[PDB]
Amino acid sequence: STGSATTTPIDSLDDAYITPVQIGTPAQTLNLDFDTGSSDLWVFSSETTASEVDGQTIYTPSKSTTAKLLSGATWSISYGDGSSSSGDVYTDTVSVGGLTVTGQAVESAKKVSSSFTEDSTIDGLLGLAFSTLNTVSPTQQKTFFDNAKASLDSPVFTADLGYHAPGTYNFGFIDTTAYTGSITYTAVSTKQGFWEWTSTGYAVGSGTFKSTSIDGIADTGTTLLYLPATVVSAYWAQVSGAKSSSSVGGYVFPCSATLPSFTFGVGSARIVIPGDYIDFGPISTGSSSCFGGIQSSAGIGINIFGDVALKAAFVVFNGATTPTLGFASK
Numbered sequence: 001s002t003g004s005a006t007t008t009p010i011d012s013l014d015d016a017y018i019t020p021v022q023i024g025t026p027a028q029t030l031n032l033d034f035d036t037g038s039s040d041l042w043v044f045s046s047e048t049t050a051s052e053v054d055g056q057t058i059y060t061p062s063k064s065t066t067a068k069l070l071s072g073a074t075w076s077i078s079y080g081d082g083s084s085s086s087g088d089v090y091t092d093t094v095s096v097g098g099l100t101v102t103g104q105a106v107e108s109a110k111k112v113s114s115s116f117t118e119d120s121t122i123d124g125l126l127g128l129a130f131s132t133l134n135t136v137s138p139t140q141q142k143t144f145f146d147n148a149k150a151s152l153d154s155p156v157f158t159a160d161l162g163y164h165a166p167g168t169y170n171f172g173f174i175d176t177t178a179y180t181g182s183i184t185y186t187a188v189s190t191k192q193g194f195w196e197w198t199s200t201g202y203a204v205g206s207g208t209f210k211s212t213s214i215d216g217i218a219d220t221g222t223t224l225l226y227l228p229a230t231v232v233s234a235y236w237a238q239v240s241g242a243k244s245s246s247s248v249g250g251y252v253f254p255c256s257a258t259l260p261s262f263t264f265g266v267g268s269a270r271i272v273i274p275g276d277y278i279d280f281g282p283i284s285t286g287s288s289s290c291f292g293g294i295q296s297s298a299g300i301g302i303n304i305f306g307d308v309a310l311k312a313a314f315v316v317f318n319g320a321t322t323p324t325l326g327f328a329s330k
Helices: 144-151 229-236
Strands: 003-009 017-023 028-035 041-043 068-078 084-096 099-112 124-127 156-160 167-171 184-187 196-204 210-218 225-227 243-245 250-254 262-266 269-273 279-282 289-292 294-296 303-305 314-318 324-328
Touching (some): 028 041, 068 099, 099 144, 184 196, 196 229, 250 294
Parallel strands (some): 041 099, 210 303
Antiparallel strands (some): 003 167, 017 028, 017 084, 041 124, 068 084, 184 324, 196 210, 196 262, 225 303, 243 250, 250 289, 262 269, 279 289
């Protein structure tokens, strides 16, 4: 089998992407944030505290003839941005772009933190990291991809995120029309449960390429590119007036600037992030200070190849017995 679904930016900055997902019988369609940095499929629901729902579409398990309470199971997750959610668990039928999994754990939120409530466009998350990170207790549950894998034509999914435009998540096949050149594959460590890999270096604008190993994660659920402070300083030093602002929480730059590109290495191949992809707009409405799309990872503990980087590439998440990542230009 295969599946193919369009993913759409939630706003004009590409802060995140939503993909429609059918849950239950008859189908209830929710718009989920596909997150290769986590491993829980959780949704706003009829069980979510009413004051914490503000415009989201909810899953109502009592209206699904295929929903079954997973007795005793609870979940609770905290994300790198400080947000969180928790609740109980149903199993139900879940379909993405024509690919159906029966018995998928659907984690129903009883509580969500304020940033989820405040984002009316995201009805939940669909985790695509390794199932060892799934938070369901006392019986850990499998991701949608893990459940689908054996049925897929090939044990892969691909992320093709757009810049200020829709893109595509495919399951079970590699669309050879969706990228240019060849796909360069690189080794993955699953030891932390992430799609963790090592970039071979970077360049700033038209500058020379610096060969240096940068370990990080391919994370569709993170907006920006988080890299070591040395690398980030070298980038922003090329932008007149750019500075790191403790009050804002990262590098800012004059909105009048034209940003240089940023290149990252995948083996001997190179992915170029255009400068425009690194502009996240005014820090507050009407400000002439703009927020940068490349930020330091120094306070995180891990480097994160988030949407800023991934949307410059066609990205293969290869879930073969030994997983690997593939990157192609597009």
